[PDB]
């Protein structure tokens, strides 16, 4: 009927903008998330290390005062 | 222009899957982390908790010592439909770990701090008693 | 096991040792022991679901540490606190976070004070309904946030701020803050998207105008006929502006019905489109 | 037909829920960032207990 | 260097010294010397995949650990040993865990209690297929989750608990159980999209209910078509709901399999739909 | 409590002792109560919102307590002190950044000093307005970031590199730097998506070349016209390089304006694409 | 403030004291101040770009350390010493990996052993080219991470294990692999969608098997027709079971072509489907 088929139209890319841009955003979203993915792996070594520099501490102090 | 455009946006609906599917992609690398690092503040935890415990005791020993082309993009449609509710899916997945870390983070700050206090207490009384 | 036993050693404990007990020394290794009975006891308090108990409890063991010198385990005891008369039935729970915020603050600790703070101004608007101490928070949280450089967190104060400021008649203040938190938010690509509903709610809140400053807004904002997201912020308000100058109330309440299929109308929105609608009829009838 | 004008706001509500999944992790970026700092900075000084700690057993001990 | 003899020097040692060996002090230096010797037994054992071995050592020195005085640092210990059985040969993983939760719970850590709680009842039921147990293990732990204002954790916890709660017959304890977590889901923008399925879950749990109990859940249930999300959970709702008080065996399993389309169904949708399925045939001809 | 009194003591007490305050021991411990004291001031300093004289201060309880032999919570001062400036209405801010990283790199912290580092050239231009020396420090900081395995961060600061680099003139050296970065992130087939607007805008950067560099890179640049993200890149590209060798500024003034539409064009590609609008009437008029 | 300087320095003072410089404590001492020599200058080579230099210092030190009895910072500096090496331009960076596993491993921690494991099997094959070797590391580092309850990481390795299994030969060994992390990975709805390409790796790994392995792989697999997802699996598949029991080899040719369409093909894929091209080549002039 050609008005409905050139509406069409109209809406389907309206429709297609939409979606090319929600999807730059996961393109983005992959660089950020990995970015600090780095960040934390350098956070777990520093923590569970830091229990041992501690540990030895609070033990030598035991042996201090026994 | 009028064909050029029932098919290109079909196109556009045909590549409007994989623009979602290479987000779960996206997706996935992501919670697979934030699953596995999620694990990981818990033994990162541990830390905070296990040196506010010892940092007591230490402080007490310092203290001791120290003293048909529209039907089929009418199913495109339908394809990005179920897996818009993929995105839902990942989006929880996602939200509920970032609430749940978010909260973890605040009490692992806390600790942290809370023991870096009994550190500088103890080191200026260490220092001290050097040698 | 028996919280009704320890609170009673508790209390017997804390106390400042004399005679023969005190000796030489005395306090803070015994008041810390107390500390430690009342959080045991709050903790089965806690899975007894009696709550009120176990918040009363916390803030005993808070109190306590207090006597001992201790302001920063002792505060976030008083977190706990908090957070049992939250999760429970009677009141404090407002309490418990100003005792906690009052030593963070003092003691150069913002970054968490504002963590609390925020905290604090939700539970004093989604229950005690204070919004005009409520505002106060948010605010002075999010300057906290500002300080820290963390953006995303003192703009969601910020966003917080504003959102219930146009709820409370506060229109013009409003938009300033949608203003600032849009001007602080375009150098960042990763909030490019998001500057629209600012734009949005900006032009939406009217201090009772009567000609531009949303036409102007809407100008400011820069929009392309291919945008996508674009579409779901000035495109409609355009039209708004058109409906409201020339106070026809039919083809606002029109507009803003196709709208709700695009882009569904929050609470917020549905409110003070309402409240647009109720200023066009009362100008028509006047 | 009428699925194409619809669908449109199917992913159009998806763009929002990215908006603030794009957010909410960026958030916690600086919530961990500042943590790094004085995470980091905190066993830095605990280094500075280690040495404290060791030395005041080569001498009671 | 052999964990073989590792394990002979600490049962040497790991005995409470008496009369003059023990001196003035017998001291749990000795205890906590063997506990060090089986971890470093059970950690070997653990590279030659004999996880058995490692399994039983860590519960060696972690069982020390608790007559050394550090019920602490012991129960995560027991943590690893639960870590060992669970992807290992015999069992004890079960024993483990509980002995795990039996510390962090009487010692006051819910928070942690509860994190070991969801894989307790996570293997209970993927694995001793004890869903009774399970459900018990998923409520109580999204308890502590709810306690500690992690509404989050707790509703994941939740939708577990109701989601197998159906499976169990329980469907009315089900449909309250997603009608909380449903009210309690909307005060949050960031579950919106979520709160639809919970919707059908409830709507599809029946009680042997024959009134509208769903068609008055499909009401409360705001919608608008145009929606999608929401196509994804009443539409089918409201074509099963006549299908059903209409005794037709052929109009809702036509449903299902139509629907079966746009959305494919899971095993949970899969088992209740087929006992709405009976609860049809069986009321016909009856 | 009075700030500028605190100020006062605290100079008091930094000093070395002498006569009969000396006594029998030195006061290693005298410059760490005025450190002590400094930081009170800056607190209250920080409250009133004066941030300028939180920041003196903080430079102050910094520099003596280097003074002290105590670099690390030295520096972490020094950034205290930064964070305070930049907030605040004055600058130093600068300053403090650069006292912090020459004690964050002397001890043996680059990992934190990369952290400043880019917070350095961040402000370094946005404020001062000095990419000469920006560049210069987004480069070392990437270095020391790919140095900590740390890959992505390292690229985070090379974008920046590259990126004000040919907003300079240096597009060669841009393109080679996208070279380096879309080299090593092929390596991590979780990159290959990103991988792909480096080749953008490495064949958009020209440095005024004869040949076909960019006709060459988008050659290099492995693209399926099925592909997505792909035709997010090169498509665009290869009309362009076509209106150029043609020296149409009108093929290549429209494809940008519809490539406008599938993906919107930020600051930088703008900026540029106007750059290279021009070389084509110049080479139309030259 | 010279590196060559401390070297020298620290060499003068690690050696077990001898004579009266001895007396009768050790230099535990001695040997600790060398670490710290060493890593100030390991320190002061990293920021000259040294490399080489830098990680044979913290070699040094690190050596040192373990004649100092401390196991654990000692692997710590070997690590460090291993991002030296790395992006460096000596070698040393897979001994002073093996180094530090030796330690984690024999120390009890097999999570970072692992995590470094992965490292090591990632550079043998981006350096070194040693597939065979990087697969049994790939493969023994998946069995800690499983074991961690990592099944995430495990995974991670797994695939990287098969994959690299395929392409040396392995065809067989690599279905099995993709077989076991394929059951493994429905206990997970996080990964059903995920699910897809393991079958139809699996199914495209053939080990020239004359049955219908693939045949039944396909049917092993769960698909029906209203799914988008599945479109990129089995589907396709069955078409290239139907090209190979025809010994048709263009219409193979011709399917990855079109399928090379709806969903492009990767490098991986590209090497078998040429194998499997060849197969059928080799079938039909026999």
């Known amino acids: 009927a050609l008005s409905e088929i050139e509406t069409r139209h109209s809406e389907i890319i309206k429709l297609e903008n939409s979606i090319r841009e929600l999807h730059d ?3 983005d979203m992959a ?5 600090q993915g780095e960040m934390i792996d350098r956070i777990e070594y520093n923590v569970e290390h830091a229990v041992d520099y501690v540990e030895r501490a609070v033990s030598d102090t035991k042996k201090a005062v026994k | 222009r009028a064909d050029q455009l029932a098919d290109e946006s079909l196109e556009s609906t045909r590549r409007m899957l994989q623009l979602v599917e290479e987000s779960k992609d996206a ?105 | 096991a028996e919280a009704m036993a320890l609170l009673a050693e508790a209390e017997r ?27 045991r006891a709050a903790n089965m308090f806690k899975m007894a679901k009696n709550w009120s108990a176990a918040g009363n409890a916390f803030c005993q063991a808070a109190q306590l540490h207090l006597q001992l010198q201790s302001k920063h385990d002792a505060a976030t005891c008083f977190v706990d606190a908090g957070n049992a008369f939250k999760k429970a039935d009677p009141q404090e729970a407002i309490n418990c976070l100003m005792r906690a915020i009052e030593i963070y603050t003092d003691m150069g600790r913002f970054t968490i004070a504002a963590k609390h703070h925020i905290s604090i101004a939700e539970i004093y608007e989604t229950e005690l309904v204070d919004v005009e101490k409520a505002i106060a928070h948010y605010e002075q949280s999010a ?41 602080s938010a375009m ?5 490019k998207y998001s500057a629209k509903d600012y734009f949005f709610k900006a032009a939406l ?34 039209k708004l502006l058109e409906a409201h100058e020339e106070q026809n109330v039919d083809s606002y309440t029109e507009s803003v019905k196709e709208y709700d299929s695009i882009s569904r109308l929050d609470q917020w929105l549905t ?5 647009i609608k109720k200023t066009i009829q009362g100008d028509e009838e006047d | 037909n009428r699925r194409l004008q619809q669908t449109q706001a199917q992913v159009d509500e998806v763009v929002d829920i990215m908006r603030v999944n794009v957010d909410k992790v960026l958030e916690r970026d600086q919530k961990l960032s500042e943590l790094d700092d004085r995470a980091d900075a905190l066993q830095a000084g605990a280094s500075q207990f280690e040495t404290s700690a060791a030395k005041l057993k080569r001498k009671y001990w």
């Open chain 1, 25 to 27: 955003m996961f393109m």
């Open chain 1, 31 to 35: 660089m950020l998330v990995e970015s």
């Open chain 2, 27 to 131: 997706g996935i690398r992501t919670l697979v982390m934030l699953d596995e690092q999620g694990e990981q503040l818990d033994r990162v935890e541990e830390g905070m908790n296990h040196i506010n415990q010892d940092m007591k005791e230490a402080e007490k020993n310092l203290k001791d010592l120290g003293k048909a082309r529209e039907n089929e993009m009418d199913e495109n449609l339908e394809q990005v439909s179920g897996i818009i509710g993929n995105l839902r899916h990942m989006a929880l997945d996602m939200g509920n770990e970032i609430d749940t870390q978010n909260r973890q983070i605040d009490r692992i700050m806390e600790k942290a701090d809370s023991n870096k206090t009994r550190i500088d207490e103890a080191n200026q009384r260490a220092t001290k008693m050097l040698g």
């Open chain 3, 13 to 39: 404990k804390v106390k400042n040792s004399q005679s023969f007990f005190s000796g030489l020394f005395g306090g803070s290794s015994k008041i810390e022991e107390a500390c430690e009975i009342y959080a």
């Open chain 3, 143 to 183: 300057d906290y946030y500002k300080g820290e450089e963390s953006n995303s967190s003192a703009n969601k104060c910020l966003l917080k701020v504003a959102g219930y400021a146009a709820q409370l008649e506060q229109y013009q203040k409003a938009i300033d803050i949608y203003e600032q938190v849009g001007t």
């Open chain 3, 187 to 191: 150098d960042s690509p990763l909030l």
């Open chain 3, 205 to 238: 809140c009217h201090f009772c105008i009567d000609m531009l400053n949303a036409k102007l807004a809407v100008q400011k904002y820069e929009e392309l006929f291919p945008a996508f997201s674009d579409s779901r912020e000035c495109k409609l308000m355009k």
């Open chain 3, 271 to 275: 409110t003070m489109l309402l409240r």
